[PDB]
Amino acid sequence: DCCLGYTDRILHPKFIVGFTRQLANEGCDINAIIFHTKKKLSVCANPKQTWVKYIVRLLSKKVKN
Amino acid sequence: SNFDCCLGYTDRILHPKFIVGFTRQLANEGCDINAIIFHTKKKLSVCANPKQTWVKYIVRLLSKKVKN
Ligand SMILES: O=S([O-])[O-]
Ligand SMILES: O=S([O-])[O-]
Ligand SMILES: O=S([O-])[O-]
Ligand SMILES: O=S([O-])[O-]
Protein backbone atom coordinates (compact mmCIF):
# COMPACT_ATOMS: atom_id res chain seq x y z
CA ASP A 1 0.00 0.00 0.00
CA CYS A 2 1.44 3.43 0.91
CA CYS A 3 4.77 3.68 2.72
CA LEU A 4 4.30 5.37 6.11
CA GLY A 5 7.77 4.76 7.46
CA TYR A 6 11.31 4.48 6.10
CA THR A 7 13.75 1.53 6.43
CA ASP A 8 16.85 1.81 8.67
CA ARG A 9 18.54 -0.57 6.22
CA ILE A 10 21.14 0.48 3.64
CA LEU A 11 20.68 -1.76 0.62
CA HIS A 12 23.41 -3.18 -1.60
CA PRO A 13 23.20 -1.64 -5.09
CA LYS A 14 23.12 -5.09 -6.73
CA PHE A 15 20.24 -6.27 -4.52
CA ILE A 16 17.72 -3.94 -6.20
CA VAL A 17 16.03 -4.59 -9.51
CA GLY A 18 14.10 -1.31 -9.67
CA PHE A 19 12.05 1.19 -7.74
CA THR A 20 8.81 3.08 -7.60
CA ARG A 21 8.35 6.69 -6.49
CA GLN A 22 5.52 7.47 -4.08
CA LEU A 23 4.46 11.13 -4.11
CA ALA A 24 2.46 13.11 -1.52
CA ASN A 25 0.58 14.35 -4.48
CA GLU A 26 -1.16 11.17 -5.40
CA GLY A 27 -3.17 8.96 -3.00
CA CYS A 28 -0.57 8.53 -0.24
CA ASP A 29 0.24 10.83 2.68
CA ILE A 30 4.08 11.08 2.34
CA ASN A 31 6.83 10.85 -0.35
CA ALA A 32 8.84 7.57 -0.48
CA ILE A 33 11.15 5.54 -2.69
CA ILE A 34 10.04 1.89 -2.84
CA PHE A 35 12.90 -0.36 -3.85
CA HIS A 36 12.05 -3.64 -5.51
CA THR A 37 14.59 -6.29 -4.52
CA LYS A 38 15.82 -9.61 -5.84
CA LYS A 39 13.85 -11.34 -3.05
CA LYS A 40 10.71 -10.05 -4.84
CA LEU A 41 9.91 -7.88 -1.86
CA SER A 42 9.74 -4.11 -1.61
CA VAL A 43 11.58 -1.82 0.75
CA CYS A 44 10.31 1.65 1.64
CA ALA A 45 13.07 4.36 1.77
CA ASN A 46 13.63 8.01 2.64
CA PRO A 47 13.86 9.99 -0.66
CA LYS A 48 16.19 12.50 1.00
CA GLN A 49 18.87 10.01 2.04
CA THR A 50 22.18 9.93 0.27
CA TRP A 51 22.19 6.11 -0.22
CA VAL A 52 18.68 6.19 -1.72
CA LYS A 53 19.64 8.81 -4.31
CA TYR A 54 22.88 7.02 -5.04
CA ILE A 55 21.34 3.57 -5.65
CA VAL A 56 18.79 5.07 -7.93
CA ARG A 57 21.49 6.82 -10.00
CA LEU A 58 23.57 3.61 -10.17
CA LEU A 59 20.56 1.70 -11.50
CA SER A 60 19.55 4.32 -14.07
CA LYS A 61 23.22 4.55 -15.28
CA LYS A 62 23.26 0.76 -15.78
CA VAL A 63 20.20 1.11 -17.97
CA LYS A 64 21.74 4.01 -19.88
CA ASN A 65 24.63 1.69 -20.76
CA SER B 1 9.63 -16.85 -6.30
CA ASN B 2 11.01 -16.57 -9.83
CA PHE B 3 10.47 -13.34 -11.70
CA ASP B 4 7.94 -13.73 -14.44
CA CYS B 5 9.72 -12.74 -17.68
CA CYS B 6 8.80 -10.30 -20.39
CA LEU B 7 8.87 -12.44 -23.54
CA GLY B 8 8.55 -9.40 -25.89
CA TYR B 9 7.98 -5.63 -25.95
CA THR B 10 4.73 -3.59 -25.95
CA ASP B 11 3.77 -1.38 -28.95
CA ARG B 12 1.70 0.93 -26.70
CA ILE B 13 3.18 4.30 -25.88
CA LEU B 14 2.23 5.30 -22.35
CA HIS B 15 2.56 8.98 -21.41
CA PRO B 16 5.50 9.13 -18.90
CA LYS B 17 3.24 10.97 -16.47
CA PHE B 18 1.55 7.65 -15.76
CA ILE B 19 4.90 5.83 -15.13
CA VAL B 20 5.75 5.72 -11.43
CA GLY B 21 8.73 3.37 -11.59
CA PHE B 22 10.57 0.58 -13.35
CA THR B 23 12.23 -2.80 -12.90
CA ARG B 24 15.04 -4.01 -15.19
CA GLN B 25 14.96 -7.62 -16.53
CA LEU B 26 18.41 -8.87 -17.45
CA ALA B 27 19.14 -11.93 -19.66
CA ASN B 28 22.21 -12.58 -17.51
CA GLU B 29 19.84 -13.24 -14.54
CA GLY B 30 17.93 -15.96 -16.38
CA CYS B 31 15.15 -14.56 -18.52
CA ASP B 32 15.86 -14.85 -22.28
CA ILE B 33 15.81 -11.13 -23.18
CA ASN B 34 16.64 -7.79 -21.52
CA ALA B 35 13.66 -5.55 -20.78
CA ILE B 36 12.57 -2.53 -18.86
CA ILE B 37 9.25 -3.11 -17.09
CA PHE B 38 7.48 0.18 -16.42
CA HIS B 39 5.11 0.40 -13.42
CA THR B 40 1.95 2.56 -13.23
CA LYS B 41 -0.19 3.34 -10.13
CA LYS B 42 -2.88 0.91 -11.42
CA LYS B 43 -0.42 -1.95 -11.07
CA LEU B 44 -0.52 -2.66 -14.82
CA SER B 45 3.12 -2.77 -15.94
CA VAL B 46 4.43 -2.65 -19.51
CA CYS B 47 7.45 -4.39 -21.05
CA ALA B 48 9.77 -2.07 -22.96
CA ASN B 49 12.92 -2.35 -25.12
CA PRO B 50 16.04 -1.16 -23.24
CA LYS B 51 17.85 -0.34 -26.48
CA GLN B 52 15.32 2.37 -27.42
CA THR B 53 16.18 5.96 -26.74
CA TRP B 54 12.67 6.69 -25.48
CA VAL B 55 13.01 3.91 -22.89
CA LYS B 56 16.45 5.01 -21.59
CA TYR B 57 15.12 8.60 -21.43
CA ILE B 58 12.12 7.77 -19.28
CA VAL B 59 14.35 5.74 -16.94
CA ARG B 60 16.83 8.61 -16.61
CA LEU B 61 13.97 11.05 -16.04
CA LEU B 62 12.67 8.92 -13.16
CA SER B 63 16.16 8.96 -11.52
CA LYS B 64 16.66 12.67 -11.99
CA LYS B 65 13.32 13.29 -10.35
CA VAL B 66 14.53 11.27 -7.30
CA LYS B 67 17.77 13.27 -7.23
CA ASN B 68 15.39 16.24 -6.71
O1 LIG C 1 18.98 -3.81 -19.82
S2 LIG C 1 19.40 -2.57 -19.10
O3 LIG C 1 20.57 -2.13 -19.91
O4 LIG C 1 18.27 -1.69 -19.16
O1 LIG D 1 5.09 2.44 -23.11
S2 LIG D 1 6.36 3.14 -23.37
O3 LIG D 1 6.44 4.50 -22.77
O4 LIG D 1 7.60 2.30 -23.40
O1 LIG E 1 14.85 -9.99 -12.70
S2 LIG E 1 15.78 -10.61 -13.67
O3 LIG E 1 15.16 -11.62 -14.53
O4 LIG E 1 16.63 -9.68 -14.37
O1 LIG F 1 19.34 -17.43 -19.64
S2 LIG F 1 18.92 -16.90 -20.93
O3 LIG F 1 19.64 -15.65 -21.25
O4 LIG F 1 18.85 -17.85 -22.08
Indicate whether residue B27 lines ligand 4 (CB < 6 A): yes
Neighbours of A16 (CB within 10 A): 21
Indicate whether residue B49 lines ligand 1 (CB < 6 A): no
Number of domains composing chain B = 1
Domain span at residue A49? 1-65
Positive or negative, the CA dihedral B18, B23, B26, B29 is: negative
Question: How were these coordinates obtained?
Answer: X-ray
First to last CA, chain A: 32
Which of B62, B64, B68 has the most A C-beta neighbours within 10 Å, making it the best mutation to test the interface with A?
A: B62
What residue ranges in chain A does DSSP mark as E strands?
16-24, 27-37, 42-45
CB contact at 8 A, B38 and B58: yes
Which of A2, A17, A22, A38 has the most B C-beta neighbours within 10 Å, making it the best mutation to test the interface with B?
A: A17
Residue in B54, B26, B58 with CA at minimum distance from that of residue B39: B58
d(CA B63, CA B7): 26
The CATH number linked to A31 is 2.40.50.40
d(CA B26, CA B23): 10
CA distance to A9, B44, B67, per residue, from A49 (Å): 11, 29, 10
